[PDB]
């Protein structure tokens, strides 16, 4: 997961949590990131917090942990392995 601050001078037509980083644009410009290894049981095996950009708040951590569980539940049961 990644955390970015919305820049007022870039709007078309205040932090945001982004899930599953892809594309050069996100890998290059997002310096606050979270990596999780979550077991479907409910516990966690790995939790990496790297805050080089926006401040990593407890809310951002909790939301990430929640999504990691939801993602883990999906990946574990999907392919019946």
């Amino acid at each position: 997961y990644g955390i970015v601050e919305l820049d007022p001078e870039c709007q078309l037509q205040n932090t945001v949590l982004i899930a599953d980083l892809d594309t050069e644009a996100e890998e290059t410009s997002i310096h606050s990131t979270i990596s999780i290894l979550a077991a479907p049981s409910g516990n966690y095996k790995q939790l990496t917090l790297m805050g080089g950009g926006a401040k990593i708040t407890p809310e951002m951590i909790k939301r990430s942990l929640l999504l990691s569980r939801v993602r883990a539940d999906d990946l574990s049961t999907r392919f019946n392995i």
């Binding site: 078309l12 037509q13 999504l67 569980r69 939801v70 993602r71 539940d73 999906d74």
Partner: protein, 81 residues
């Protein structure tokens, strides 16, 4: 040879021999191992409050793409200082 050196009967001759040459030259690729998995297009999912994954439609992403392109080009607006 060069242009102007060549005459009209010579051109129609060339057109003739070409038509002769052109008209003289005249099972499905089912997967074996990695044929189903590798060329598979990108799909995206969203996890609702239920924790269940939800399929994001392809055309939704295509429209999402073309709408941004119009909002970036035409909807560039004017910057006042």
């Amino acid at each position: 040879i060069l242009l102007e050196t060549i005459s009209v009967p010579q051109i129609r001759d060339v057109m003739e021999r070409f038509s002769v040459l052109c008209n003289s030259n005249i099972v499905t690729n089912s997967s074996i191992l990695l044929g189903k998995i590798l060329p598979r297009e990108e799909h995206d999912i969203a996890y609702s409050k239920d924790g269940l994954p939800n399929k994001v439609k392809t055309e939704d992403i295509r429209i999402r793409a073309q709408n941004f392109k119009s909002a970036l080009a035409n909807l560039e607006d004017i910057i006042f200082e």
